[PDB]
Amino acid sequence: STGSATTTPIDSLDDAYITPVQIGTPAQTLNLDFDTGSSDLWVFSSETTASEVDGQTIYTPSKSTTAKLLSGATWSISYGDGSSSSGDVYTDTVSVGGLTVTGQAVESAKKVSSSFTEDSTIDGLLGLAFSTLNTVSPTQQKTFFDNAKASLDSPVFTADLGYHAPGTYNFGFIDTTAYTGSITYTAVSTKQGFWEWTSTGYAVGSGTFKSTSIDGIADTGTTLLYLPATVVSAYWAQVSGAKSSSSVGGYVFPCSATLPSFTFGVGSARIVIPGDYIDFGPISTGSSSCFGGIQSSAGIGINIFGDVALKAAFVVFNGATTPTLGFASK
C-alpha cells in the first residue's frame, strides 16, 4: 500500500504545516501537525477542557463506531518549545492520504497548554519519530508509520515541504518526479529516538564550504534551523545590522536586508537554503526588526534541522531495518 497527502502552511510565515487525517467511522477529518521529532498521535477532542478549545476541530470518539477506549492508558508530553498536552487513549481507524491503519492509538487530549489553544489551525500532532519516544503508559504505543510499515510497498515516508506553498507527505514510495538530481543517503542514529544524523558542514552565501560534523535531528515539527553558536554567528555576521537579542529571544535583522543563502552538507552533496527562507518577518506587527530563521541551539542540547532546512529538500525517512535519511535538491 501507499498514501499521499498534501501538507499546507498554517500561515504566511510557514510557522507549521497541517495535513488532513481521517479518524474513525464515519471519518472525522482533523488537520494534524506531522512531527518527525515526536512519537505521539494526539488530538483535540470532546474530552478536552472546554476553556482550552478555541476554534480547533475535535475528535469525538463516542461518534466513531470503531473507537475503543484503551483501558487504563494515559499520556503526557512536553515539547522542546515548552508546550504540553495530556489525556487518555482510544484505538481507532486512521487514514492518511488513502493509507489506512486499523487499531491506531489516538491520544485524546484532556488538557493542552496555551500555545495549542491559541493556534486554531492545528487540531493535534501526528508523531513520526521512533516509537521508543511514545509517551503512553503503562503500555507504550506505536506511531502511525510503525503500524503501517509492514503493509507499505517500501518502508519509507517522504517529506516535501513547500516554501510559502503546499507540499506533500508520501508513505510507501519515493516520487522520482518530486526532486532533481539524486538522493544522497546518510546514516541515522536511533539512540535518542529521533531521526538523528550528521551533516558534513556548511557554507554562508557564496562563501567557501566549511567541512565540519554537525549532529542533529530532522524535525518537521520544528519551524526553524537550530545550529551551534559558532555556525549561527558566522551566518548573521554576513547581514548588516543583525544581532542576537536576549529580549526578543534570538537573532534579529533589519527587515530591509537581503539575506544570504545557507548551505548544509549531506555527505558529499549540498542542500542550499535560499535567503528568503530564513526571513520570519517583523518581531511584532509594524516593526522594522525581523526574526531570523537560523538560531543557536546552545542550551537546547541538540541541533535541529527544522522546517527552514527541510523545506529546501526532498527528504526520505527510510524505516528499513537499519534506518537512514535521504536528501535531494528540488
Curated annotation (Swiss-Prot):
It comes from Cryphonectria parasitica. Residues 17-328 form the Peptidase A1 domain. Keywords: Aspartyl protease, Disulfide bond, Hydrolase, Protease, Signal, Zymogen. Its EC number is 3.4.23.22. The active site is at D35, S199. Disulfide bonds join C255-C290. The lineage of its organism: Eukaryota, Fungi, Dikarya, Ascomycota, Pezizomycotina. Belongs to the peptidase A1 family. This is Endothiapepsin. GO terms for molecular function: aspartic-type endopeptidase activity. The keyword Protease applies. It catalyses: Hydrolysis of proteins with specificity similar to that of pepsin A, prefers hydrophobic residues at P1 and P1', but does not cleave 14-Ala-|-Leu-15 in the B chain of insulin or Z-Glu-Tyr. Clots milk. GO terms for biological process: proteolysis.
